[PDB]
Amino acid sequence: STGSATTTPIDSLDDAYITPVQIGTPAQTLNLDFDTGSSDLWVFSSETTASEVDGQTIYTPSKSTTAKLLSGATWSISYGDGSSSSGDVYTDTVSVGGLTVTGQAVESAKKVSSSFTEDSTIDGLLGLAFSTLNTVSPTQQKTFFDNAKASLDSPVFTADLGYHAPGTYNFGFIDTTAYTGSITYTAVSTKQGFWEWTSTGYAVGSGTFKSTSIDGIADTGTTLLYLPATVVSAYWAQVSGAKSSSSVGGYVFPCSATLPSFTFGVGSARIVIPGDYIDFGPISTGSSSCFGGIQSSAGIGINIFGDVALKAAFVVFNGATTPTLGFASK
């Protein structure tokens, strides 16, 4: 089997991407944030505290003839941005782009933090990291990809995120028309539960490539590119007027600037992020100070290849017995 679904930016900045997902019988379609940095599929639901729902579409398990309460199971998750959610668990039929999994754990939110309530475009998350990170207790549950893997033509999914445009998540096949050149594969460590890999270095603009190992995660659920402070300083030093602002929470730059590109290494290959991808617009409406798309990881504990980086490539999440990542230009 295979699946193929279009993923669409939630706003004009590509702050996140939503992908339609069919849950239950008859289908209830929710727009979920596919997140290769976490491992829970959770949804706004008929059980979510009413004051914490503001425009989202909700899953109502009582209207699904295939929903079954997973007795005793609870979940609770906190994300790197400080947001959180928690609730109980059903199993139900879940389909993505024509690919169907029966008995998928669907985590029903009883509580969500303010940032989820405030984002009416995201109806939940669909985690695609390794199932060892799933938060369901007392019986940990498998991700949608883990459950579908055995049925897929090939044990892979791909992320092809667009810049200011829709893109695609494919399951079970590699669309050879979706990228240019060849795909370069690189080793993955699953020891932290992430799609964790080591980039071979970077360049700023037309500058020379610096060979240096940068361990980080491929995370479709993080908007920006978070790298060591040395790398980020070298980037922003090439932008007149750019500075790190403690009051804003990162590097800002004059909105009048033209940003240089940023290149990262995948083995001997190179992925180029155009400068425009690094512009996240005014810090507040009408401001001439703009927020940068490359930020320091120094306060995180891990480097994060988020959407800013991933949308410059066609990315293969290879879930073979020994997982690997593949990157191609496009």
Curated annotation (Swiss-Prot):
EC numbers for this chain: 3.4.23.22
Keyword Hydrolase: yes
Active site positions, chain numbering: 35, 199
Cysteine-cysteine disulfides: 255-290
Annotated GO biological process: proteolysis
Enzyme's top EC category: hydrolase
The Peptidase A1 domain, residue ranges: 17-328
Protein name: Endothiapepsin
Reactions accelerated catalytically: Hydrolysis of proteins with specificity similar to that of pepsin A, prefers hydrophobic residues at P1 and P1', but does not cleave 14-Ala-|-Leu-15 in the B chain of insulin or Z-Glu-Tyr. Clots milk
Keywords attached to this entry: Aspartyl protease, Disulfide bond, Hydrolase, Protease, Signal, Zymogen
Lineage: Eukaryota, Fungi, Dikarya, Ascomycota, Pezizomycotina
Family: Belongs to the peptidase A1 family.
MF (Gene Ontology): aspartic-type endopeptidase activity
Organism: Cryphonectria parasitica (Chestnut blight fungus)
